[PDB]
């Protein structure tokens, strides 16, 4: 009996997900506070990205391989959870 098989993951983007660690592209995308979440792709250069990640669903997914999330301010009259950085090519050498 080779150890307990609890790691049942690997789902493509465009399908209904609970957390972000279930899809192949680790990005369960939140439909703005309502919580009906569907998987998506990671962010590209000059797009909004979440600089920290939890064990769960994301409002703006993190940056691609070699690019950083630039999370310095982004609070132009803040009431909801709308505070995000921009993807740029700093995390390489």
Ranges of each domain in the chain: 1-93
Distances (CA, A) of 74 to 3, 49, 60, 68: 46, 11, 13, 16
How many Å separate Cα 79 from the centre of its chain? Answer: 21
Q: Which CATH superfamily is domain 1-93 in?
A: Lipase, subunit A (2.10.80.10)
- Write the CB contacts of 44 (distance below 8 Å, at least 6 apart in sequence): 63, 64, 67, 87
- Backbone conformation region of residue 42, classed left if phi is above 0, alpha if psi is from -120 to 50, else beta: beta
Q: What is the spatial distance between Cα 85 and Cα 68, in angstroms, rounded to a whole number?
A: 9
DSSP state of 69: E
Query: Going by C-beta distance under 8 Å and a sequence separation of 6 or more, which residues neighbour residue 54?
Result: none
What tokens appear for 19 in the block? 């957390």
* Method by which the model was determined: NMR
List the end-to-end C-alpha distance of the chain, in Å, as a whole number: 45
CB-CB contact of 39 with 27 (8 Å): yes
State both tokens at 64: 């691609």
Q: How far is 11 from 70, CA to CA, in rounded Å?
A: 28
């Amino acid at each position: 009996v080779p150890d307990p098989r609890g790691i049942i993951i690997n789902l493509d983007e465009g399908e209904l997900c609970l957390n972000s660690a279930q899809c192949k592209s680790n990005c369960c995308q939140h439909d703005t506070i309502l919580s009906l979440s569907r998987c998506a792709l990671k962010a590209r250069e000059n797009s909004e990205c979440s600089a920290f990640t939890l064990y769960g669903v994301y409002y703006k997914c993190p940056c691609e391989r070699g690019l950083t999330c630039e999370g310095d301010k982004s609070l132009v009259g803040s009431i909801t959870n709308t505070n995000f950085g921009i993807c740029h090519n700093v995390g390489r050498s």
